[model samples]
Target: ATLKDIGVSAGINILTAFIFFIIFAFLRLQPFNDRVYFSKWYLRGLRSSPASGGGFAGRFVNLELRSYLKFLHWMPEALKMPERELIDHAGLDSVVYLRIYWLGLKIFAPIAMLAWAVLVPVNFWAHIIMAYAFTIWTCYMLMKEYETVANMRLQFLASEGRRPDQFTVLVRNVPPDPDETVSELVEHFFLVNHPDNYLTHQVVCNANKLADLVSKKTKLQNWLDYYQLKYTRNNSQIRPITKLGCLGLCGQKVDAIEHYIAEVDKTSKEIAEERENVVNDQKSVMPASFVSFKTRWAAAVCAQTTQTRNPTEWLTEWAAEPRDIYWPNLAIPYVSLTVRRLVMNVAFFFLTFFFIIPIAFVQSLATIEGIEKDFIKSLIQGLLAGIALKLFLIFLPAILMTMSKFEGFTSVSFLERRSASRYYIFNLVNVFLGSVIAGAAMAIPMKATAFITYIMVDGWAGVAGEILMLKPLIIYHLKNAFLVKTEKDREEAMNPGSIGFNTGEPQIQLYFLLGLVYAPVTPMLLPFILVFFALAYVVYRHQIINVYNQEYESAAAFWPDVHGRVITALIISQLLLMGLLGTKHAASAAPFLIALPVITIGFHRFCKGRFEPAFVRYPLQEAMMKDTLERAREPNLNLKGYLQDAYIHPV
Candidate 1:
C-alpha cells in the first residue's frame, strides 16, 4: 500500500472501532433506560431548527463564553488537591510511581525532542513516531493507575461483607409503638421494606417509608405528619430521662401550670354555685399563653376571686428535632459558592453545545481558522462534538451517583443502601446509552444535511493541538476531585468493591491517547477513528464489571438466558450505522429518525427480562452454578427484607 492508502485504512479502522465501542456501551446499559432523567436525544433535533441567539454575532459570542464556563466546571475539581488527592484518588500507593513514570518519559522525551528539535537532517516522521509512542504509553499507564485506586473500595467490600445481607431487617423486627394511632398498614409498608430494618438507625418511624413506592398524599400526611409530631412532642421535650439523666429542667412549666389550673377550677365552680345566678365569667378560667408562667399566676389570682380552671393543658406537645446535615449545608448563604456552582453548570451546558454546533453545521464562512466554508471540517467537528456531548451528558453524572451511593455514603436506610450497586451501575450505563438513543432520535436532521462538501486544509492539526492542550487540565482536575477526600471521609466512604471502575473518567486519557495514535495518519477520516476507540473502551469496562461480580452471579453468562430482546437492538443499530457509512448498499430510506423508537422499546423490554430475578420469584440455577454464583455475589445483594414477613423475626 502507498503511504496515502496506509493512512486512509488506518483511519477507517479507528473509526470502525470507535463506532463499535459506542454501540456496545449503549447495549450493556439498555436495560435501565426507562427510569433515568429522560432519553438523551430528546433535544437533539432541536439544534437543527436554528433559534435566534439574538443574531449570528450574538450566538457566536454566547457560544464562546459558554465554552469557557463548561471548561471551568469540568477542569478545576482536580486542582482542589494538586498532589496527594490526584495521585491517591487514581489509586497510586505513592507519588513515587508518577515520578518513576515521568522519569522514564523524561529520558525518552529528550531523544524524541532531539530528533524533532535539534536534528536538522532527520525525517520529522521519525520524531513523530517516537514522541507519539512515549506520550500515548505514558498517558495510558497513568490512567490505568488512577482507575485501579478509584475501584479499590469494591475490593474491600467483597472481602468484608460477602453474604449479601440486608441491614433493614433490624427495623422491621422491632418498632416503637408509643401510640395506638400507629397503623399496622404503615408498619408493613415502611419498616418492612427498609434495608437496615434497624429501627435504631431512625429515631422517627417515617424514615422507613420508601420515597418512590408510595403516592404523594401518604408521603405528606402519614409519613411527614408522624415525623413533625414526633419532633415537636418528643424530640424537643427537655429530656429529663436520657441526656439530662435524673433532672432535666424541661416540662417544669407544664407541672406548674397544671397545679395552678386545678386550684382555679375548684375556686371558680364554688363561686358559681354560691352566686346562684350562674355567671358566665365564673364558668371558665384561662391564661393568654400556654407557656407563660406569668399568665398562669394571673389566672390563679382571678380564679381565687371568681373561680375556674385554666384551659391550656392541650398545648405542651413540642419536641424539637435538630436538622440533619443536608439541611444545614444548604441553609448557609454562601453566595460565592452558589454563584460558582451555577456558573459551572451553565458553562458545562454551553461547552457541550458549542462543541458540536460548528462542526456539525453543514455550511459556514471560511476564515484563517481554516474550516471556513468547509463541509468536511465542519462535519467532522460537529460529529465529534455531538458524539462527545452524547457521551458526557448521559454517562458523566453516573460517576457522581455511584460515588454518592457507595457504601461510603453513610449507612443509609433500606431503600437507600440495599443492593445499590445494581441501581448505580444501571443508571450510569443508561445515560451513556441515552446519548446514542438521542443521536438516533436526531437522524432526520443529520441525514438532511448529510450531503457534506469541503475545502479541507491543515485544520485538524489545530483541533488535535487544542484537545491535547485542554485535556491535561481536565484530567488534573478530575483526579483531584476523585482523590481529594478528607482523611475522615476516606476512612468512612462505603467500600467500592471495584465499582470505582464503574466511572469513565480515567478514559479521558484513553480517549485522547487513542485519538493521538490515529489522528496524524488518518486526519481526513476522523469519525471512524473515534468509533473504534469508543468501542474498545466499552468492551473493556464491561469485562471489568463482569469479573468484578463474577463470583456470585455471572452477569455475562446471563445475557443469553435473558437480554434476548436487547440483542435485537444491537442488531438494528449495527444495521443503521453500517448503512450510514455507505457499506450497506440497500438503505432504509427513513434514515435513523425512523429506526430509533423501535430500538428503545426493544431495549427496555430486554432490560426487564434481565432484571426479572431481582423483582420476581424465579427458580435457582442448576446446583453447581447456583452455589458458585451465590458465593461470588456481593454480600450486599438480595435486599428482600423490606418485602418479606421474616424481617421482624430477627436473625
Candidate 2:
C-alpha cells in the first residue's frame, strides 16, 4: 500500500461519488422522482410542494439551473433538522440507524489519527500493541454507546403515553378444554386468576389463508387500476379485456375492470365470511391471546410470572406493539418452533462456511481477467467480484429472517436481532475468512487491498448511490407510467420502505471489521474509511429525513445487536492480527494481543449485565410509576375500550 496506490483508489472513488452526485442532481428535479427522493417528508406532511425557483417550468422540474451548481447543498440541508425533530420525523429506529455511521466515525476517526500520529512510525510489534489499544478504546466506546442507547430506548418507551402494549401481555399455549373454545377458556382462566387486573382479551386468529387471499386481491386490484388507466388514456380504442382464469391468461374473455371488480367483491364477501368463521370456529382460533390488564404494573408482573401448574400452558410474555407483532407465528406450535431452530442452526453453519464453494468457481473466472488487460481488467474483475459478493450476501439476511419467522418470534425486534446475529456469522466466515484465505493463497495482500477497494466502493460510492436512489427512481417512473391513475394508486406507488437494520447493520459491521483489521496493518486504508463514514452519515441522515418511511418504532431495541456485532468484529480483528503478528515472529506481543479479545469479551458481558435488561424487560417500578402518573393524568380513562380491538387480525 503506497501513496501512488492510495492516490489511484481515492481518485476512482471520488470520481464515482461525483458521477452519483450528477445523476442525483438531474433525477431529483423530475416530478416522478419527488416522491422517490422526498417521500418521508411527504408522508409526514412536512413538505407538500417543491420549492419554487422559476416560473411555469419550475412547477414540475427545477428550472433554477443555478441550484445544480451546488450539487452537495443537501448536506447542509440534511443537517438543518435538529436531532429531536429528526426522531419525530423518522422514529428512533431511523435515528439509531443513521447514528451507526456516526458511531463508525466516532470509533475510527480517533484511531485513524492515532495510527498516523503514533502507530505508523513504530516497529512491527508496535502494530500488535496498537491492536490492543484499539480494542480497549472500541470496547469503552461501545459500552458508552450501548448504555446511552439503552437509556434512550427506556426513556422513549416510558414517555410514549399509555400505549396498549404497556398494559397488555401475550399469553400463549393455553390448555385445551373440551367444553370451551380457546377464546372462552382464555377468558375464563384470566378472569379467575387475574380478577384484580384483567380487563379484556383478544384471541389470536389463524389468518394466513385469509391474508394470502387479501394479497391476491390487492394484486388483482393494482392490475385493474393499471388497465383502467390505459383505457382512459386511449379512449379511441376498445376497453381492454382479459381471460377470466389462470391470472387472466386463458379461458373466457371479459372486461378487465369488471372482472377485477367482481373478483374484489367476491373476495370481500369471503373475507367477511372468514372473519365471522374465525371468530366462531373453535379450530380457527390459536391458543394465544393479547390479554389487557388494568395497569402496566400488573401486566409486567403477569409477563414475568408463571400462571399454571404445567409451565408450558398459560405462558405469558410482554405483548409486542400492534404493528410489531409477527401474526403468522401466533399459531406456531412450540415443538415445531424448537425443531425449526435446530434445523436452521445446523443449516446456517454450512451456509456460512461452505456456501461459497460453488461460488468460488465463478470467482475464479474473475481472476481469469488477470491474464488479459492489466489495470482496467483487474479493476473490472474486482468490481464484478464485489457485485457478486453483494448479491450473495443480500439473500443471506432474507433467508435468516425467514428462519427467524419460522422459529416463531413474537416481536419484529427479536426477529431482526436473530437475523442480525446470523448475518454477523455469515460475514465473519465468508467475508473475513474468505478474503483472508484467497489473499493468502495468491501469496499477496490482494484480499486486504480488495477489502480496502470494497470499502471505498461500498462505503463511499455506495453512500452516494443511496442518495441518488437510482433503482427506486426508475421503478417509480415505471409504475407511474403504467399503474398510477388514481391518487391511491400514486400513493401506493411511492412505497418509501423502512430502514432495514437486519441487512444494513451487517454491511456497516463489515466496514468496522475491515477498518479495525487494516487500521493496525495498513494505516493507508483509514482515510478512505474516514471519508466513507463522513459521507455515509450525511447521506443516510438525508435519506431518513426525506425518503424512508419507517415501518415501526423499536425504540432502538436493535442497539444490542448493533453493539454486540461491533464487539464481535473487534475480537475477530484482534485474533486475526494476532495470527498475522505470530507469522511475522512477534511472539512477545502474542499474550498481549490474545488478552485484548478476552478483555473485550468480558467488557461485553459486563455491559450486557448492566444494560441489556433495560432493553428486554419492563421494571415494575417504572411500570408502577407510569401507572400512578396515568391514573392522576386521566382518572376516568377507559383503557378497556381502547385495547379491546387493538389485537384483532387485519384480514
Candidate 3:
C-alpha cells in the first residue's frame, strides 16, 4: 500500500501488457498462427497470408527487424474500422458490446478527475455537490447510450437480409386433440386462430438419437481425413491401423481410413432413417412449433397477442433466428421454465452474498502472519491464495451460464445477458462489499491504496493475460500437432471463439465501482482506472476485430442491463461517501449524500421506462415498414419455403 508497492505493481502491470502485445505482434506474422489471431478478417476475406511463397524462416516468422518496431501498431489498426464497418465485420452484438466499455469511460473519466480536483481539496459540501454532478452526468450519458443502442437495433432489423425469424413466432404447449396428432393440431389451431397470416410451421422433434449419429459420423470423418493425409504424406507405403471398437482400443485391427469411411457410411444411413422418423413418426413431435406468418406485422401481432382461452396451451413469443435459437430449450414446458428461473434466482442470491465466506477463509490462511505459523510457508501459500480466488471468480460465470441455460432461454444473447447480470451482482457483493467487510474486520480505514494495487494487478495485468490467450494458444498448438489434417481440422483447431460477454462485461463493471468509490477520497486510483479502460478498449477492440466471432446479435438489448448496473454502482458510491462523511461529522453534507441515491434511482426508473421498451419490444410500425420494404425488394420471395425448415434442429 506504500508508494513503492504502488510503483512495483504499476511497473509489473505495464511490462506485462507490453509483453503480451509484443508476443501477439510476433505470433500474428506466422502463417500457421494467422487464423488463430486474425480469423475474423480472414473469414470476411479482407486479409490473406502475408507469408505466401516466402522462404522457411520468413514463411513462419517475420525475419525483418523493422517489423518489430511497430509491435504496438495494432492499437490504431484495431480502431481504424468505423462503427458501420465493425458491425458488418463482426455483427451488431460485438460492436454494441464494446460500447459498454466506452460508456464506462464516458461516464467515469471526467467524474474521476473532477472529484479528485475539487472534492479532495475542498470542504464536504464540494463532495456533496460532486455526488449530484456524478449522478446527473451519469444518467445523461446512460440516456444517450441507451438511445444509440436502440436505434442500432432498429437499424439492424431494417437492413437485415431475408431472415425467417422476422416473420415467425414460436408457439409452445399446444393442447391435445383426440382427432389429431401434435403437428396436425398445431396446424389446425394456427390456421383457425391466424387464418389471414398463417403461412407454414415446423414442429419440434426429438432428434437426440439423430444428433448422436451425426456427431459420431463427424468424428469418424475427421479421423478418416487424418489417416488419408498420413497415407498421402507417406506415399501410400504405410497405412494407418486401428481397432474396430470403442475409442479404437477393443476390437480387431483394421485399416483406419477404411474403417472410418465404413462407420461414417453406416452412421449416415442411420441418420437418414432417424430424420425420416423425426419427420413422420407421431412420437417424435413435441407440443411446440415455429409458426411463420406472411408478414412481419402479423408475426409481431401474433407474438404480442394471446391465442387461447387457457393462455398456457397456445403460448407464443418472438422466434429467434435459426442460428440464434437454442434448440434444447424449445421442448421445455412453460411451468418448468418458470420454476427453473425461480430456483436459479435463489441460488444466484446465495452464491453472490454468502460465497465469500470460503474466500475470506482462504485470505485468512494466506496472510503473512497466518503463513508464518503454518508448516507449509513461503510464496507457495500466498500463490495458492491468489490462484484460489482467481479461480473462484472464474468459477461463478460458468455456473451462472449453466443456470441460465437451465432457465430455458431461447437465444445465446439472452443467456449471456442473464449470466452477466448474475456476475455483476456477484462482484458487487463479494469484490466490493467483501472488501469493505475485510477493512472493517481488520479495524483499519478503507485504504484506497489496496484498491490501487487491485486496479494494477487485476485490471491491467488481467487484461494482459487475456491478450496472451495462454489457454486457447496452448490448446491450438496441441490440436495442430496431433489432430489437424485438412483445412476443416485446422479451422477447428484454431478455435477463435466469440467474446465471453457474460464474464468480461461484469469484470469491467468492477473497475467502474472501484474508480467511482475512490474518486473523491483518493484521486490516485482514477489514473489507474482510466488506464484500465484505455488498455481494455484497445485490447478488446483488437480482439473483436480479429479474434472473436459474434455468436448472436441481441441488437444491444443488454444496454439496459449495463445502464442499471452503472446506476447501482453510482448509488453504492453515494452510500459509501455518506458513511464516510457521517463518520467525519459532516452534518450538512448528509442530506445531499442521501438525496443523491433517491435522485439516481428515480433517474434509473425514468430511463428504464423511456428507453428499455425499445430494446425488448418490436414496434408494429417498424415491423410494418420492414415488411413493406422486404416485399418490394423481393417481390417473388417464397415465404413458405423460406420458413419451412428454419426451426429444425441442426442434426
Candidate 4:
C-alpha cells in the first residue's frame, strides 16, 4: 500500500483489533455482561491460603498490572503503524516500532506545543475551544483503549465454562465418615445451596399468605375474593439497598449481595401472593383439578444462597466465590480484595489534596516560567518565601505541640468500607509512593529532554517535552492498574480482544482531603508502587499476626493523613498529565472543572432521594449500612455523605 493508504489501514486495523478486544472484555469481564457471570471474579470472595495462591487481591492486582503492561507493549505499535499489530511484522517489528513512535512523537510534540502557544495569547473562550479539541483526541484514544479491553473480555468468556468436576471438588467438604454416604452428604449440601430448593422454600413461605387469605374469606367475601385477596394478601417490599444504597452499589460487595436478596424477595413476594390468591379463587369457583397449595415464591428466593446448617459449607462456598465473581480475575469490593480495592480507590484520590497544592507550587512556577519567566520568578520568590517562613517558623511548632489521641477504624470500618480509616491508610501510602514517582517522572525526563534539546536546538527547552514523554508511560501504567489490559495481554494474557476503560466524557472534579507527598528518583518505580507494597505489607502484617500476636493497637488517627495523601497523589498525577500533554492551557480545564459539580450535586441529590441498596458484586454497602445505623444510634454520629461517597465498597 501507498504511505497514506498504509497509515489509514493501520489505524483501521488497530481500531478493529481494539474493538474486538473491547467486545470480548465486555462479554467476559464487565459486571454488566452475561459472560461475566461465568468468570471467577463474579463469584463471591474466596480467600484461599494466603500462603498458597496469590491472595485474591494479589492475583487480581497482578492480573490488572500484567494486562496493562501488555497493552503498553502493543500500543506504541498501533500509534506508529496500526496495521502491523493486526498483521505479522515479518521481522520488521523493532524498526517499525522505533521508526513510527519516534516519528509520531516528533510530529505530535510540535503540534501540541504549537497548540499551547497559540491558545496562550488568545482569550479565555479561544483557550477553552482549543482545550476542547485536544480533549477530544485524548478522549478518543481513551475510548479506543476501553473498546479493545472490553472485546478481550468477551473472548475470555467464550473460552471458559464451569470447570470439569467442579461440583465434585465443591462437594469434598463432606466428611468421609461411615454414617453418611457420599451421595447423601452431597445431596444434603445441594438441598440447601441449590437454586431450585432455595426458591421452593421461599415460594412456600409466600404462598402461606395467599392460602391464609383464602381460608379467612367469608361466604360473601369469597364470592369476589380473587382480586380482593390478591391485592390485600400481599404487599410490595422495595429492596431498600437496591434502589438507595448510594443510589445503588458503587463497589462494595457484601452490601450489594444483601440488597439484591432483599429486593428480589420483596418484589417477588408480591407477584407470588397475587398468583396464589387467584388460583385459590379459581379452584373454589370452577371444578378445577385441586393441587395442594405450595408456598408462594418470590424472585428473591431464586437469588438467595441456601442457608447451610454446616458452617463449613458456607465457608467452602465463600472460599471459591470471589475468584468466580470478578471478571478478568481483578480485585473487587467485599471479597478478598474488598478492603484493598476500596482503600486503593479512595487513596487514589487522596494524593490530589496532600500533594496537589505543593505540586501545584512547582507546577505553577514552571508554568509561569514557560509563559513569562522574569515576572513569575520575582512573584514566586516573594510569595513563596513569605509563606515558607511563616509555616516553618510560626505554624509548624504549634502543629507539632498538638499531640493527640485517636479513634480506630472500628468507628468507620463498618461505616465507610473503602473510605474508612483503614483503607485510607493503605491509600495514603500509595500516594506517598506516587508523589515520589511524580517527582522522578518529571525530573528524569526533564534531564533527558533537556540534554537532547540542548544538543539539537541549543536553547532552553520548555518543560513540556519532558512532561509529554512521561505521559504515555504514566497514563498507560495507571490505566493498566485501574481497569485496562495490554496488547501483549491480548496475545498471551487470556483473550486477545478485550477492551478495558471507561467511555465517558471528561469533566473537572474537586476532591477535598486533608497531608504529605513523598518524592523519589523514579516516581513510577520508587514510592508509588513501593508505597502500595509497603502499605499492603503493613496491613497484612498487622492482620496476619493480630490473632497470633494478640495485639489490639488501633490506627484510627492515621486515617486523615491517608485520606490527604491519596488526594494529593491524584492531583500530582493529574496536573503532571496536563503539563506534560500541553493541557496546562485553558482548553483542557473543562473536564476537571465539570466533574466537580456533577459529582457533588448528583450524589447529593442521590442521597436525598432515599438510600437503598443495589445488588452489586459484594457486601460492602451492607456492612456500611449496618455500621451507619449502629453509629447513627450513638449520641453524636456524623453522617458525612461525602466521606462515604469517596469509597467504592466491595461486598
- Top candidate, metric TM-score: 2
Which has the better lDDT: candidate 1, or candidate 4?
Answer: 1
Which should have the higher lDDT, number 1 or number 2? 2
Estimate, for each residue in 1-651, the C-alpha lDDT of model 2 and write its tens digit: 345564576687789898788777776776545767888877887666544321123333443355545577888999899987877778888888888888888899889888987766663667876787788788878887887788778777777866788889999888878888887898888889988999999988888878877876776676666666677543222233354333543444544452357877888788777777766766878778889999999999899898989978899998988988888888787668889898889988777656556345436656776555445566667666656665666567888898888778877878887888888777766676763454322222235666766777777877788888877777877886777665443346678787677877777887887788778777877777788888888888888888888777778877877888888778778877777776757567778777888888899999889989887778999998888888898888998899998998876
What is the alpha-carbon lDDT of model 3 when measured against the actual structure? Answer: 0.75
Instruction: Name the runs in model 2 displaced over 4 angstroms.
Output: 1-3, 49-56, 59-69, 232-269, 353-355, 358-363, 435-446, 487-491, 583-587
**Worst lDDT 10-window in candidate 1:** 285-294
lDDT of 3 by residue, 538-592 (tens): 8899999888877666677778888888888888888887877757667677777
**Cα-based lDDT at residue 55, candidate 1:** 13
Candidate 1 per-residue C-alpha lDDT over 584-651 given as tens digits, one digit per residue, 9 for 90 to 100: 43354334323443544454455445443332211222223333454466434333432232211110
Cα deviation at 170, candidate 4, in Å, is 8.0
With a 3 Å backbone cut-off (N, CA, C), the pairs that clash in candidate 3 are none
User: How well is each residue in 1-651 modelled by candidate 4, as lDDT tens digits?
Assistant: 133432343243334434433333332222222112221211213322222332233232333332543433322332453433321221121222122123223323433454545643341444334433433333333234233333332232222232211111122134444565444444454455553421111000113344443333322232222222334344222233332333222444443232334444554566466665644442222110001101112112212344457654322221122122111121111233345445544644554445434543543454465556343344343334223322332231222111100111111211222233433332233222333344532431222211121111111111112111223334434433432333323211111111100000000001111101111111111211222222222222221211111111111212222223333433443334444444454554647545433433443344223221121112334333433454445545332321222211121
TM-score of each: 0.27, 0.90, 0.87, 0.24
Off by over 4 Å in 4: 1-144, 161-189, 192-651
Best by the lDDT measure? 2
Query: What TM-score quantifies how close candidate 3 is to the native fold?
Result: 0.87
In order, the Cα lDDT scores of the candidates are 0.29, 0.76, 0.75, 0.28
